[PDB]
Amino acid sequence: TDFYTIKDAQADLAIAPLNLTVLLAPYSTTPATTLESPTDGSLAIPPGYKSVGHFEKQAGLTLGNEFDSKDIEAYGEPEPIRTIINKRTTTFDFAMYQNQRNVLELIWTQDFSNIQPSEFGGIVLEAPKVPKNIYYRAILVGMDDRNDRPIWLYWLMPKVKLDKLDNQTLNDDNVIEYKPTLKAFRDDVVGYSVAQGFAGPGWRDLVATAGFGEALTALTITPGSPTVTVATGASHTAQLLVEGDNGINYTPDVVFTSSAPDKASVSAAGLVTGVAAGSATITATKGALTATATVTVTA
Amino acid sequence: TDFYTIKDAQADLAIAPLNLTVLLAPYSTTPATTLESPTDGSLAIPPGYKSVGHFEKQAGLTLGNEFDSKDIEAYGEPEPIRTIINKRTTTFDFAMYQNQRNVLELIWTQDFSNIQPSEFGGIVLEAPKVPKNIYYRAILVGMDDRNDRPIWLYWLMPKVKLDKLDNQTLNDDNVIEYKPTLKAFRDDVVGYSVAQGFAGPGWRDLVATAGFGEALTALTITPGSPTVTVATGASHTAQLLVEGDNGINYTPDVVFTSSAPDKASVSAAGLVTGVAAGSATITATKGALTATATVTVTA
Amino acid sequence: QRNVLELIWTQDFSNIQPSEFGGIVLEAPKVPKNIYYRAILVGMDDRNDRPIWLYWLMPKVKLDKLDNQTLNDDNVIEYKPTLKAFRDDVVGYSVAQGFA
Amino acid sequence: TDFYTIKDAQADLAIAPLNLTVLLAPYSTTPATTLESPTDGSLAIPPGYKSVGHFEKQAGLTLGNEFDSKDIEAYGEPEPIRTIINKRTTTFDFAMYQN
Amino acid sequence: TDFYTIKDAQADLAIAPLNLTVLLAPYSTTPATTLESPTDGSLAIPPGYKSVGHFEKQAGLTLGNEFDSKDIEAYGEPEPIRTIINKRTTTFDFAMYQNQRNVLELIWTQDFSNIQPSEFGGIVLEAPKVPKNIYYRAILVGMDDRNDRPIWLYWLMPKVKLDKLDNQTLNDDNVIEYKPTLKAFRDDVVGYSVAQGFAGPGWRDLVATAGFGEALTALTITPGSPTVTVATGASHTAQLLVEGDNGINYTPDVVFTSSAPDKASVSAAGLVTGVAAGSATITATKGALTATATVTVTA
């Protein structure tokens, strides 16, 4: 066995967040559990999460993790007999550009929903008597677009608070930047302080390689023998569903073909419509994996 | 839903302070509450506020916000059960150029209003025996000129005090700079320490987008059916006011047209003067939104 | 991949099952776990098609530190952990350097 | 439509400065607003502007324009979201003979 | 196989822009999707695009493309594992001669629409206090004539902006020149920054050779059995239409003949007019291909 086989390096698993956005929601909003829509796996932001818009490219977004722990030392032991890790504090910072309502609410620790613009649109935002402890739910979601197969990787922080505010420098050749450092706290309802998740058509290919689940070896069609009516109606169309040995819906990844197009009409999605009564064979093929189904069409 | 729809990035909301000025006023002056003139929304500096003139471009104007908070930690809780934020310290610094009375008064912490120039204009400004605690009111107003529609964004600090004075370096190829770092304190009568406000014709367009108020959907002409006299007099002219569903006066933004110019004369501002007796229709149109009014002209 | 995320999150993700469309969610644990790994750091020096494999054997390592993670639109995401090697009683050493 | 009609080329709009003069006036002089006389439209130079005479033909007169702008770059945007053009510096040079 | 067959050189595919024009339109104009007229395939410029006229022959027109990419390097890999290409900047420049409105507006970053000539026709164009960000839509269309079969090849740039302005040297024996370098940006409405296109009867003869689509192997007449009345009326004449398997209309390229001129008269265009009632044969011949249709003429 040579060195490169032992290395087992996969360049595709390296994900670059080509685009990124941060969505903040008020603490009354139900926290998001996953960003994958159950219908088709598309990106589905839960209601109540509103983006903060553009932010500085050069500064980017900085995530920081800090452990605080106490080590118990016994006599004659060079190394601790037990280490008690109290907490893993997570923070993140970036440089917002847009001067919208939620950005100013976050940087001022105030609820400006009751602020009404004057007769000519002029508004005045007053800092509170003492800063308030306001908690938000944050979704940091980024898209890596490779071969038109995006990978959406997101950080879910169900309870964040404004930890720090950097100095605000005003220049006549630069836009005004708000640079908050937000600390994520543990939320009891969901039971975590921060979660990292992956989704998308691109990640469906690499989920087997990355080590989550089992490798795709067999391809199966769930409605193997459907019966379709020639006449128009609710039961005149039957939607196929293709799965793998590891339980992942591979329907968007497979290619659908019909042995006899006239007897049954199949699309790229996998819908089956029986134009003419008879026997048809619908084959879903992805790579070297092939699944076959038989459709009977009755007028 | 694709990524860019979720991101919802508005490049217009990014405001760059192309021009900036700082106006200091003595503590006896009534603090400013808003910089928007009630008459037409123009920039209106209250009396007593005098500018400090030019300041260094490269140094710019630095705004700093600091939090001092004490966290209450209970047994068995990695994160504090309650955090108490005592105050939010706000400071700002910049490098003044002009050697005028107010700049020297601020840097020297002295009242030079009683200083009388000598026979040939020479003056001598003595530092006080002990530094005085002098409080000023500060307006930091900046204009972003985009498409001849300026946005004036301002910081109102009703009670500031000189906190620091940076080293003063004299060079034969550079002007003399005064670099004060001013700290803003809470003012009891107005109820805030620092306030951030936006105004101007440019900001009126972005009020709806920024999230303050409600989006503009319908336009209404409040004097829908006015009657105007042919003959000259005080009641020979009538001013039209156009408003929106969100209560913002959109008169400068709309375009005025007259059905028959001879019957009633309308200008860009919205004034209606009845040249000839009869019925006229005045239409105010902004974008795709339109409002109509009928004017009856009686000799 | 799975092992890198387990190392950086101090959690066992072997029980994580991908969703219907391959999407996964990895939750940080309530409290960080003390997880120990065995590390082999093996390097090849290929000279005249006669490679030299020199390796560091650390039979018991633990995640000591995690550096800041910076996200940029023109760079991939890097995980930068500092791992501390501990004494292992069964083998009798904390770190061993070998050549072959 | 043939290509020539779409081109809409006109040789009459190509203006060649067959003769050229530079006139310098002290800062106290009232700046010129236009060089056409309101009486007849002829070339009328305001008083105080004194010409510098001949200058070298080979060098001619060179006019340069430079822009100093800063581009605001936002995350995920290959092109800047806003370009702030500070100034447009105009310079010109020539080689005078007359002392 | 000899070298000449392997090389497969086609001297006809070399296109030389014998004539070139640049057309600039204001940003409010609808961007051009194609320069091919759907009615006949001739060069049809969308309204609002006004040509800049003559420009310098010796300098010509220069198009430049630059790539800004970052290479992700990994330990032990001599070559990068992933190259992240950010943008493809396209620019173009040329030396305008004409002193017209659009040229001066482009070079001065100003709009002179409201500039009114004085009593004697004189005008004064004042440069703006600060240069404005004005965007244009550009069409760079060139014509190559070969055996009276022109080829129009064009570059569409939906969003161009002034980037550089070269030095402007005045000579007593040379006309005045303006040398702007324009950078093409990305327009989200159309989804591209630059698009290269080809059209014209000359191109139609080279579509198959160039590799876009399949070659022409069969010819077909869509009105196989048209009916034309002897009596004058709307349905007196029927226009033929020749197509191929590749999907390209070859009607202008084919030659129409009629077996019996008295029964039906056909021209080079392909229109069929029924002069005498009876059966006629219309044959369209192009190269080695022929298409036959039968026309029945009823009185």
Side-chain angles (χ1 to χ4, degrees), chain B residues 52 96-104 168 176-178:
Chain B
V52 299
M96 304 172 185
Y97 281 156
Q98 288 184 176
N99 309 265
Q100 37 188 37
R101 180 163 76 63
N102 55 346
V103 168
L104 302 165
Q168 191 168 44
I176 295 171
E177 283 145 21
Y178 313 99

Side-chain angles (χ1 to χ4, degrees), chain E residues 2-298:
Chain E
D2 58 342
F3 199 85
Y4 190 99
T5 301
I6 283 160
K7 173 142 197 187
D8 191 72
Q10 295 295 325
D12 287 324
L13 282 179
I15 307 169
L18 298 182
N19 211 351
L20 195 59
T21 70
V22 189
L23 288 78
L24 287 166
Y27 193 45
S28 313
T29 315
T30 305
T33 55
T34 184
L35 295 198
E36 199 165 63
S37 179
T39 301
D40 60 345
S42 77
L43 202 60
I45 310 299
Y49 285 84
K50 188 181 187 291
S51 159
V52 304
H54 279 303
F55 45 91
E56 189 187 318
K57 185 184 286 185
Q58 192 276 333
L61 191 144
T62 311
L63 286 148
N65 291 300
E66 69 93 20
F67 302 88
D68 51 353
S69 58
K70 179 164 174 291
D71 307 303
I72 304 308
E73 75 298 336
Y75 198 113
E77 285 277 15
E79 67 196 13
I81 58 170
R82 189 183 170 163
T83 300
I84 293 168
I85 301 166
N86 293 115
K87 177 181 62 174
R88 182 213 186 109
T89 301
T90 291
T91 65
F92 68 110
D93 54 343
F94 50 105
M96 299 171 182
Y97 283 158
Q98 302 201 306
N99 314 269
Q100 41 188 40
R101 173 147 70 76
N102 54 346
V103 168
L104 293 157
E105 288 177 347
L106 169 72
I107 72 163
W108 284 116
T109 63
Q110 183 65 288
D111 48 348
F112 299 129
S113 68
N114 50 335
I115 288 305
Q116 301 271 26
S118 78
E119 186 153 322
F120 307 95
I123 58 169
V124 165
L125 315 171
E126 310 213 337
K129 167 203 297 161
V130 288
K132 294 209 262 283
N133 280 315
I134 301 177
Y135 294 107
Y136 303 87
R137 317 220 184 259
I139 285 173
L140 277 63
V141 59
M143 191 195 52
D144 188 356
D145 293 336
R146 39 175 67 179
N147 300 118
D148 195 71
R149 291 190 72 70
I151 308 175
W152 306 296
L153 78 166
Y154 51 87
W155 293 262
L156 305 174
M157 300 179 185
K159 207 198 199 172
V160 296
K161 190 181 77 176
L162 180 65
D163 183 72
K164 289 190 292 185
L165 192 58
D166 268 350
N167 281 351
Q168 181 161 338
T169 297
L170 312 187
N171 290 116
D172 52 12
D173 60 334
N174 185 35
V175 307
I176 196 173
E177 306 187 333
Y178 312 104
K179 287 184 266 193
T181 294
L182 295 152
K183 189 191 299 296
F185 293 81
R186 175 174 177 79
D187 184 57
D188 59 357
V189 171
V190 296
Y192 63 90
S193 57
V194 64
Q196 180 166 0
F198 301 85
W203 177 247
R204 184 165 53 245
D205 275 336
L206 298 174
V207 176
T209 294
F212 301 99
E214 296 82 7
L216 170 74
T217 55
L219 278 175
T220 306
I221 296 156
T222 295
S225 296
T227 304
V228 291
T229 315
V230 168
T232 306
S235 68
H236 183 289
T237 59
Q239 172 65 68
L240 282 195
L241 188 153
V242 181
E243 288 212 319
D245 48 346
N246 50 8
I248 286 163
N249 190 340
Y250 280 101
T251 305
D253 292 338
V254 305
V255 171
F256 287 89
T257 67
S258 69
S259 66
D262 52 345
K263 297 320 165 193
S265 63
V266 70
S267 48
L271 174 75
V272 178
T273 288
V275 192
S279 82
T281 290
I282 314 290
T283 306
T285 302
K286 154 176 165 40
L289 299 180
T290 182
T292 300
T294 52
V295 181
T296 50
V297 184
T298 68

